[PDB]
Design a protein around this nucleic acid. Structure first.
Ligand SMILES: COC(=O)C[C@](O)(CCCC(C)(C)O)C(=O)O[C@@H]1C(OC)=C[C@]23CCCN2CCc2cc4c(cc2[C@H]13)OCO4
Ligand SMILES: [Mg+2]
Ligand SMILES: [Mg+2]
Ligand SMILES: [Mg+2]
Ligand SMILES: [Mg+2]
Ligand SMILES: [Mg+2]
Ligand SMILES: [Mg+2]
Ligand SMILES: [Mg+2]
Ligand SMILES: [Mg+2]
Ligand SMILES: [Mg+2]
Ligand SMILES: [Mg+2]
Ligand SMILES: [Mg+2]
Ligand SMILES: [Mg+2]
Ligand SMILES: [Mg+2]
Ligand SMILES: [Mg+2]
Ligand SMILES: [Mg+2]
Ligand SMILES: [Mg+2]
Lengths: 190, 175, 201, 109, 252, 139
RNA sequence: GGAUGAACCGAACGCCGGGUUAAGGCGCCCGAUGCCGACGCUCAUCAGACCCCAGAAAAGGUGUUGGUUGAUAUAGACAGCA
RNA sequence: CAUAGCGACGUCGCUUUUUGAUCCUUCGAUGUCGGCUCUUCCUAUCAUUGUGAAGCAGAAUUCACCAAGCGUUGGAUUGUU
RNA sequence: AGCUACCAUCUGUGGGAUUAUGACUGAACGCCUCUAAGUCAGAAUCCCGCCCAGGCGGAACGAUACGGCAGCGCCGCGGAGCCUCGGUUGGCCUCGGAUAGCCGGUCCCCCGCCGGGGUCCGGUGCGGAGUGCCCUUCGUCCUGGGAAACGGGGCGCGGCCGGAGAGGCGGCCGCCCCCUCGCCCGUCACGCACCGCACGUUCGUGGGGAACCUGGCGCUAAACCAUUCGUAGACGACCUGCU
């Protein structure tokens, strides 16, 4: 069964504009510019009005599998809007039983070094994705603050940090040490 | 039974008269066959299954094609049938949109063969009827109930791929 | 035909283009294929890589030197693919096989000439848009071909010079259209003749 | 002054998969890629022109190296514009993939 | 059936063409990866195996049993008279691989270097490069040479210098010099071309290329052993004494 | 993205099939593949027709779906499809192709001579414009 | 013809020309679909591809496509949050 | 506590590394056990590289997956397998 | 001396896509979700490098045969001719690319007067179209009207530039000599008009091999055997040396 037409409309706030070059979405907000293309999905994108800036995603004659792509595109567009308007701040808490985790935020927050993870002499060097800034929270003793515009890049850096401190050859249920994402939040809280 | 473009047949037959009933009752059936000979054969098969009749034991008194009474009108067809799958017999109800009843039956045959590997000899069509748009239950058919239907032809595949076989310009599929 | 048939391999499917070429060389026709790294193969990249690795595994166990000569260059791969569709163990097949030339990128003998494109082998029309495909250049690069970067750089230079040539030709065509505008009182007599018989809408 | 004959290619003999009828041959007329377009070329004289080592007599000219095997196209073949030709002598197999002229001699138009 | 016990294979499959080397010198087959960042430097040199001896030194390896101790290590003496660079080859990258673009030979080729071009130096007229060297004097020839240099500058990717040894400095019978292409690395193409041009007809002492206490790679052709059996060629196991048709063979 | 749609009253051009080279109006939509098709003024009686042999145009009529021949014919004649279509570039390109195909040998000869002279004059003007544009020298 | 095969499918044979076919085929090998073939299903990181025949079972899949039966629902379903 | 790890009652397969059944080839001969030597291959993986699970606290162990690159030995007895 | 031993000593290497698996975003299924689309990490596996050999595969360069009549190379399309191998029967001298979009032109911003951007105007069953474009061969003689006359022809010379991935190619100046001829529509007659007949019509001065004459410009060498070596070796082959 091919559904004749499946569409969903995403509203754009007044402080941010979106420009389309075919299926390449250019989103320029106050926090910066995010650009992402969708050439791998054969859908129709159009801007509706000059008043409220409605964006519609259209797919004509789609089977069950490709109909799921419309809302995926809509969610990605909303994530880009949220990033360029409010931004993405991920809070990760480092937990430990005996050995405290020493975290060094190197130049511009692009490099993170972990010293005493489980007391081993190795040093973990994790480089953040470009455009993502990592920092140590000034309000908490063990908290890492990751800030950036693109949700995928920020969460990818967070996943790299989380997987970097991985216990090996031990019962991970008992040995719960490592750095783990506490919450996924925003910047500027607006 | 092979296929083609099927045709409706109003087949009327009866038993041979006997010195027990001089006027055996007549029976009328609608049979969709590529030709009238296959229509007669399927009529004999169906009357043998339902009543206690044989082709030799009886006769066929009428066999004519049933033309569509409104082939210029789009209409919804509801079809009841049974078929023998690889693991038994099941009953189905399917819906189609076509101008002709016979074309709708042919569409049903092709669809059953495509979806369930059902060969034509295994399928017993038991009821064909035009239905209103309100009585349709299959969403693939119901979605065509639009007084303002509108859709483009998104990605048109080039069909004249060999005239020319060699060319300088890459084809355009946007129209 | 009598001339050399130049085919651009970009966006073309392997099997279809190979079959068309093999049918062409059998007819006593000279065929040259350029930019063989632009050939697409249906199916996702991992499956085709597994296929080529399975091809790599097939070797003469006693003496791999005599074994199947796995060619790694994309043009050589396409050449072997065409050889699979020909009676290459006969004189007729070899004579046909000598009429085919394959190259990675576009050589200077052919970069200054126009390139044909076969509709029956294009990925855009012979493949459903929702499917996945594999580039011959990337597949060759990860299996043992060694000259992907230099090929890309030379294609970049060729694209630069071709863009210059295209801008020159656009200037020439603009000047030609301007010239058509300048003279029409001395042209309209023949213009009406041409427009009468279909030419020059 | 002009080419004055259509270009055709000796594609091969009429044949099965494991049988070869050499008494008749299949030709590919350039630009004719459909069966319905083969009507114009049916019955037309077709010639195979080649050179050899010894001089042969030439009608209306001095002897030269040119030799001709005459024939004529009988009927259409296949659906892709293939045609069949019966020659006075069976075509040598070295001519496969070479030029065959369609002489337009029996004009019906 | 399976062999009753497993055992590692005799010999290596990475040296299967166990044949006499087609060359007596020993070619490089891979020069170090070039970067423009480094200064201009040669990547290879030629030497002659003079002999072997042993030395006494003190080791400065902490954590070792021999730390701050005296050791005796065998060393090999390689006499290396300075090379004489006599030409420049420029290579260009192709999808078919590296190929020789243009070659320029310097004037006044050394007499020992000219001996390489002749199988029979005794019967030669010594005419090698006689007409070539005349193009280093005429203005048209120098214009041709400058045009070749500019072509190498604007087209070639890697350049190599032809250098020859000095038999007259060595106690060997052979007076025939050894020619070799040596890659010039560490800079832009123009810089290395000019640097090679400033070293034509000059001597490159071995210190300018290799330094103290650095580790290098040695390329050469091993000692010939003639025709050898499997016992010495592959170090296979000798068959027992009771074997009839021979014990220095491979049984299966 | 899309400017042309399949809808009731949309005028479509027949590419191939029995009715090739004719203008028709879509009446109703059938099973994503066929459509009720009517040319009342282009001599195309009402019949089913696959979408694959259709090439859509920019003329859209305004009649209810599944209406009879009368209303469709009136909607065709009012705001005449024939005259407006004949002025389009598409129809005149088709006409030019048809008359080029039916051109005889004498017409080919005349066209060859006319194109010879026209191209020579155009090339002379091009050379004049090149030499007029070649006298440029400014810091 | 089934690549190939004593038995399978067709069909049995003097030597040839023309025509038409069987079984089987018509991307190239290799003659024929270079039909603007029709309808639908199917993505496989061991896909699938034709009697005999040359490779598979039970049991599963919230992959997808149909179909049967039942149930809830503006007297507000279902799913989420409390 | 069915399913960490096992699996009675039943039941479906795979292998030709066992032993059976047959006699299709070989009876104008294909040298028949075992050992030594040597090469390659398979994976239903003993260890090693990387993982998942446990009645995995650590250690040690078990179960399972990607996996056949590398290795799987020295001896007393017996002609032995 | 030589050979030789974990019976002495030295040396043994880098990268990519990734499996399993663990994750991110994220629907399908207003929740979830490593998966559907798109992403990340990832290994004794795989591939490549290093290493070993080097194609009926290529590159660049060197020197290319005498002191006697003696061989050779290039330049002339120079000539007269031979032998042999046959194919073919106008050319197109080039954007990149996308296909749920393209292509052209133009007014403003920014990079060396040309390009990249932002507007605006057009075309899109592609007509600035390969279903396409260019040229097009009967030739001459009167003979007018138009096109042109800032025009073409030079195997005419000299100079310059661009092209290196296989440049084997292309473009531009200066001088000199021609005709005002060739392009269209007209006038005027002529040519073997070979009496119906085929291989005619081109690439083409085609490719290759010997040979003669005709002129000019230039060159005067290696290889192998033998011998010697022993870094080599069954013999070959290999590394050498020889007023
Ligand atoms: C009594 O034991 C034998 O039969 C072995 C032998 O006699 C060996 C003789 C070999 C010579 C060289 C003498 O022909 C023999 O005739 O070999 C036969 C042999 O003659 C060559 C034939 C067999 C048949 C096929 C293979 N050949 C393989 C060896 C063999 C082994 C046997 C066997 C028969 C064969 C035969 O029975 C039990 O084990
Ligand atoms: Mg073992
Ligand atoms: Mg003995
Ligand atoms: Mg048979
Ligand atoms: Mg078979
Ligand atoms: Mg017959
Ligand atoms: Mg076949
Ligand atoms: Mg064929
Ligand atoms: Mg024997
Ligand atoms: Mg034997
Ligand atoms: Mg396994
Ligand atoms: Mg443990
Ligand atoms: Mg190994
Ligand atoms: Mg040792
Ligand atoms: Mg979410
Ligand atoms: Mg995964
Ligand atoms: Mg990765």
């Amino acid at each position: 069964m091919k559904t004749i037409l499946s569409n969903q409309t995403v509203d754009i706030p007044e402080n941010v504009d979106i420009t389309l070059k075919g299926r390449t979405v250019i989103v320029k907000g106050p926090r910066g510019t995010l650009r992402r293309d969708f050439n791998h999905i054969n859908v129709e994108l159009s801007l509706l009005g000059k008043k409220k800036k409605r964006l519609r995603v259209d797919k004509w004659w789609g089977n069950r599998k490709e109909l799921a792509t419309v809302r995926t595109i809509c969610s990605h567009v909303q994530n880009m809007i949220k990033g360029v308007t409010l931004g993405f701040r991920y809070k990760m808490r480092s937990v430990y039983a005996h050995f405290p985790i020493n975290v060094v935020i190197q130049e511009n927050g692009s490099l993170v070094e972990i010293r005493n993870f489980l007391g081993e002499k190795y040093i973990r060097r994790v480089r953040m994705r470009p455009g993502v800034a990592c920092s140590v929270s000034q309000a908490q003793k063990d908290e890492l603050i990751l800030e950036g515009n693109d949700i995928e890049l920020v969460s990818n850096s967070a996943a790299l940090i989380q997987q970097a401190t991985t216990v090996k050859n031990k019962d991970i249920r008992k040995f719960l040490d490592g750095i783990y994402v506490s919450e996924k939040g925003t910047v500027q809280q607006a | 039974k092979a296929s083609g473009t099927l045709r409706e047949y109003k087949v009327v037959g009866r038993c041979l008269p006997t010195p027990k009933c001089h006027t055996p009752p007549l029976y009328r059936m609608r049979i969709f066959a590529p030709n009238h000979v296959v229509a007669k054969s399927r009529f004999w098969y169906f009357v043998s299954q339902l009543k206690k009749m044989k082709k030799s034991s009886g006769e066929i008194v009428y066999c004519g094609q049933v033309f569509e009474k409104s082939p210029l009108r789009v209409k919804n067809f509801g079809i009841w049938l049974r078929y023998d799958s690889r693991s038994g017999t099941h009953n189905m109800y399917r819906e189609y949109r076509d101008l002709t009843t016979a074309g709708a039956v042919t569409q049903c045959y092709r669809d059953m063969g495509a979806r369930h590997r059902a060969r034509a000899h295994s399928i017993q069509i038991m009821k064909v009827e035009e239905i209103a748009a309100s009585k349709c239950r299959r969403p693939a058919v119901k979605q065509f109930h639009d007084s303002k239907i509108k859709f483009p032809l998104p990605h048109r595949v080039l069909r004249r791929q060999h005239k020319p076989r060699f060319t300088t310009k890459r084809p355009n599929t946007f129209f | 035909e009598v001339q050399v048939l130049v085919l651009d391999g970009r966006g073309h499917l392997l099997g279809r283009l190979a079959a068309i070429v093999a049918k062409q060389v059998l007819l006593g026709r000279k065929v040259v294929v350029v930019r063989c790294e632009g050939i697409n193969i249906s199916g996702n990249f991992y499956r085709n890589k597994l296929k080529y690795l399975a091809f790599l595994r097939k070797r003469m166990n006693t003496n791999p030197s005599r074994g199947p000569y796995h060619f790694r260059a994309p043009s050589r791969i396409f050449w072997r693919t065409v050889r699979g569709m020909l009676p290459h163990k006969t004189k007729r097949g070899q004579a046909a096989l000598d009429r085919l030339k394959v190259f990675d990128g576009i050589p200077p003998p052919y970069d200054k000439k126009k390139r044909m494109v076969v509709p029956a082998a294009l990925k855009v029309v012979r493949l459903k848009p929702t499917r996945k495909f594999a580039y011959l250049g990337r597949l060759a690069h990860e299996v043992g071909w060694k000259y992907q970067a230099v090929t890309a750089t030379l294609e970049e230079k060729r694209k630069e010079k071709a863009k210059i040539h295209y801008r020159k030709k656009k200037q020439l065509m603009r000047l030609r259209k301007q010239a058509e505008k300048n003279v029409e009182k001395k042209i309209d007599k023949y213009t009406e003749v041409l427009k009468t018989h279909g030419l020059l809408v | 002054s002009g080419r004055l004959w259509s270009k055709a290619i000796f594609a091969g003999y009429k044949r099965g998969l494991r049988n070869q009828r050499e008494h008749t041959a299949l030709l590919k007329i350039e630009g004719v890629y459909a069966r319905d377009e083969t009507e114009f070329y049916l019955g037309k004289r077709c010639a195979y022109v080649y050179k050899a080592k010894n001089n042969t007599v030439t009608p209306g000219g001095k002897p030269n190296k040119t030799r001709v095997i005459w024939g004529k196209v009988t009927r259409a073949h296949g659906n892709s514009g293939m045609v069949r030709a019966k020659f006075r002598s069976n075509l040598p197999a070295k001519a496969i993939g070479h030029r065959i002229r369609v002489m337009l001699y029996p004009s019906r138009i | 059936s399976h062999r009753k016990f497993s055992a590692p294979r005799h010999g290596s499959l990475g040296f299967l063409p166990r044949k006499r080397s087609s060359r007596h010198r020993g070619k490089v087959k891979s020069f170090p990866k070039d970067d423009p960042s480094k200064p201009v430097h040669l990547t290879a040199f030629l030497g002659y195996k003079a002999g072997m001896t042993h030395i006494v030194r003190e080791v400065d390896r902490p954590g070792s049993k021999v730390n701050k101790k005296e050791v005796v290590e065998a060393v090999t003496i390689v006499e290396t008279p300075p090379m004489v660079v006599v030409g420049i080859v420029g290579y260009v990258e192709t999808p078919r691989g590296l190929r020789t673009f243009k070659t320029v030979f310097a004037e006044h080729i050394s007499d020992e270097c000219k001996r390489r071009f002749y199988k029979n130096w005794h019967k030669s007229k010594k005419k090698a490069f006689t007409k070539y060297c005349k193009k280093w004097q005429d203005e048209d020839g120098k214009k041709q040479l400058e045009k070749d240099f500019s072509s190498m500058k604007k087209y070639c990717q890697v350049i190599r210098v032809i250098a020859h040894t000095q038999m007259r400095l060595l106690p060997l019978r052979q007076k025939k010099a050894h020619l070799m292409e040596i890659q010039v690395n560490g800079g832009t193409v123009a810089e290395k071309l000019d640097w090679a041009r400033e070293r034509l007809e000059q001597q490159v002492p071995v210190n300018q290329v290799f330094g103290q206490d650095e580790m290098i790679d040695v390329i050469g052709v091993t000692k010939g052993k003639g025709y050898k059996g499997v016992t010495s060629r592959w170090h296979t196991k000798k068959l027992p004494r009771k074997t009839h048709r021979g014990l220095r063979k491979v049984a299966c | 993205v899309f400017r042309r749609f399949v809808e009731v009253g949309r005028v479509a051009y027949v590419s191939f099939g029995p009715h090739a080279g004719k203008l028709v109006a879509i009446v109703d939509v059938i099973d994503q593949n066929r459509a009720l098709v009517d040319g009342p003024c282009t001599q195309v009686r009402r019949q089913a027709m696959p979408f694959k042999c259709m090439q859509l145009t920019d003329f859209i009529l305004k009649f209810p779906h599944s209406a009879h021949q009368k209303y469709v014919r009136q909607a065709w004649q009012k705001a005449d499809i024939n005259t407006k279509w004949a002025a389009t570039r598409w129809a005149k390109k088709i006409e030019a192709r048809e008359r080029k195909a039916k051109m005889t040998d004498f017409d080919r000869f005349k066209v060859m001579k006319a194109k010879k002279m026209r191209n020579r004059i155009i090339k002379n003007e091009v050379k004049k414009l090149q030499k007029a544009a070649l006298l440029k020298a400014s810091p």
